[PDB]
Amino acid sequence: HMETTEFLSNRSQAVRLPKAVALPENVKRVEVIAVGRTRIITPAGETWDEWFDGNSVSADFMDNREQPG
Amino acid sequence: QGHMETTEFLSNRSQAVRLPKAVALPENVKRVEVIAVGRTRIITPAGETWDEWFDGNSVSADFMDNREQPG
Amino acid sequence: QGHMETTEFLSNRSQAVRLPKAVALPENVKRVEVIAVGRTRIITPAGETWDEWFDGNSVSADFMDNREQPG
Amino acid sequence: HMETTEFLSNRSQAVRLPKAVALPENVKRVEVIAVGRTRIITPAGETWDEWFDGNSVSADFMDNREQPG
Amino acid sequence: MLKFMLDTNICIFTIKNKPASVRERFNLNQGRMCISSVTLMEVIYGAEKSQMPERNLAVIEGFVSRIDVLDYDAAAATHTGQIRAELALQGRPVGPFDQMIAGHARSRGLIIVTNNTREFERVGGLRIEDWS
Amino acid sequence: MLKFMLDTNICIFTIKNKPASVRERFNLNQGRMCISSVTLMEVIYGAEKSQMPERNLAVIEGFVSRIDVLDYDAAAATHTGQIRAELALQGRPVGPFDQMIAGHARSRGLIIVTNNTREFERVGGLRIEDWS
Amino acid sequence: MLKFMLDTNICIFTIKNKPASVRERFNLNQGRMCISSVTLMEVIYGAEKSQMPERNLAVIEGFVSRIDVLDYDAAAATHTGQIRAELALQGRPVGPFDQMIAGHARSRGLIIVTNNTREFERVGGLRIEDWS
Amino acid sequence: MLKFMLDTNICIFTIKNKPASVRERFNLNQGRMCISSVTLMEVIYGAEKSQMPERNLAVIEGFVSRIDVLDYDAAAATHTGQIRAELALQGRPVGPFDQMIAGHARSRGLIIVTNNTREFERVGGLRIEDWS
């Protein structure tokens, strides 16, 4: 809920996760997903967990493919 | 693609994650805020809120308004 | 850019020039004709003449003509 | 005026200039220019010689820049 | 690494319903999952067709960030051409977009993942899975 | 560079009829001509559909050897989605394959060349020429 | 991805007036907004033209921090050339900078967003929206 | 390596007249020569404005293959912004396109090559050469 800064390390901008918002020690590797400006840091394997929670498509989202045939 | 795997390293007392060049942030961004959801962490460029700038500092009346485009 | 420098080597009795990956020909081209102008050599993909194909082999009448696009 | 074939050599498609259309031995290095399908093989330094000869722009080519100002 | 191609059907099925069964499945084969550009144009269409394009598209963008999008290549076009021609003789009808998705997979040798295997069963030489 | 995207309509029209007007247009704008991979699969299909596929395909391959084939990319897919959605609301009907070819053109800003102007004229933000 | 190209007209209009209608449009289509480098130099010029450049530039920088700046490329230049040539024959007059912004949009197929529709409406193959 | 930026003026001067003096000069500094995208849009315009676009453009394509084309970047835009603002106070008038070319050069520190140095002399901090 606070803020941090990135830093060029090992030729990568990387990040410094605060101890206040640090990940579980049981998480060795973490998938990083790029969407627009935001970057999603999801545990390895645990990638799709963010997308399924929330981010609800609108109720009028056309389920019909309307494929000609 | 868009997906990209990376490991983690504790430095400066803070556990840290490398950003591969695929997900590398724009170099313009100099500060970043971190949000907490489940075990996933969300990284948003700080101060990117459009509403912030609109109520933010406003520009002087000496703006030409006229584009003075050659013509 | 478009410009690109390369050296030369004689092989197979024929003096030969490497094509850097910038000027690398499309892999589809399998044969090439060489034209001679001054000291400059001109490399044109052989058989690329549009007029050749037009008078070339023509296609059977069993072509549907109808696109039979789904609709 | 005949024809030849390219060949993957040193990770390059390269070319085999026939002895019939070989370059002067005094030409050590040769600039290669890419325009469309055609590739121009001009002696080093002697690059622009092809473009100035022939390839005449049309007589009605607007010399005027017509820059607004 | 990439082994699975998600058809258009399963994508909307996930995008709309977000089923729990697919949750862990997607998580398991993360990095081994791809979608055809044909699939992309459909999901984009549904979003832009909807009354809240920006929202649905955002959900779609998130989906597309995890999976690799495959451009329709000449191999896919040629393969689909054959696939289409075969189906003509068989009499079996397959959807226009679905035809392209099938050929696209066969060209790159991917496994098709679909909730409705029925349509894809007509086309031969394809591996079809049901992740619903 | 590349300025024109050749529709499926005009391609078949040229392939079959071999029209003189088109040859000039072809020779004049040589090098500025491309086709979508979507365009390729249709003609590939048509060729294999005939009683002499190898004959028909052979002529077809020669055509594609001179033209550059443009892979249907995510940009093409997204633009096609919009076009489809736009046309959906307006009610104007455009063919599936044609929609994809149009989106490919708009994505890279190419000029569509087709004998059927009225159909593509429905699509917005697109430039259409008729070389027939 | 990116769908809208912000004209110089509307940018200054927003920068000065800070209109509420635009804010919604901005927040709604956040992330889909870009400006041409041509657009950047004008506002940079206008800022430095004022009696408080650093003040004005500071507000300007904040704006550009949220929007992605698109470099004027050869594709943009060529498309602008065509637009200029087209408009030349037709006689419709469009501003120099505006021409360049339009070509940038058409090259990447973006939607132009501008308060002055009539001027950009002269340009063909372009989609224009007015968010004012 | 790249050290010289050819303004629009000298390019057309060469493209139209093809002067012998420029022949050896161009040959000498081959590989150290570049042009701005602003310059490109102008030469494209002249070609497409002409009654034989395909021909003139072909000549242009050949020219562009030897020289490197530089995309207008934020640095050029910002630099031109300053350049434009300065000229306002000085009262000295410089052409719209020429202004952008000048800033583009200063941004990358290139040497301007022009047949008409007069206009560029107003702008400061630039190195101007006359290859005519």
Numbering used by the authors:
A (entry chain B), D (entry chain B): 0, 1G, 2 to 68
B (entry chain D), C (entry chain D): -2 to 68
E (entry chain A), F (entry chain C), G (entry chain C), H (entry chain A): 1 to 132
What does the primary publication say about this deposited structure?
VapBC TA systems are the most common Type II TA system in bacteria, and consist of a VapB antitoxin and VapC PIN domain-containing toxin. The related vapBC locus on the chromosomally integrated Escherichia coli F plasmid is mutated in bacteria that are tolerant to beta-lactam antibiotics, before subsequently evolving resistance.
Moreover, the structures of VapBT3NC (2.6 Å), VapBT3N+A13P+L16RC (2.8 Å), and VapBV5EC (3.2 Å) revealed complexes that are virtually identical to the wild-type complex. However, we noticed that the DNA-binding domain of VapB appears to be quite flexible and with low local resolution, which means that side chains are not visible in the regions containing the mutations. The hydrophobic residues Val5 and Leu16 both point towards the internal, hydrophobic core of the DNA-binding domain. As both residues are changed to polar/charged residues upon mutation (i.e., V5E and L16R), this could destabilize the fold of the domain affecting DNA interaction.
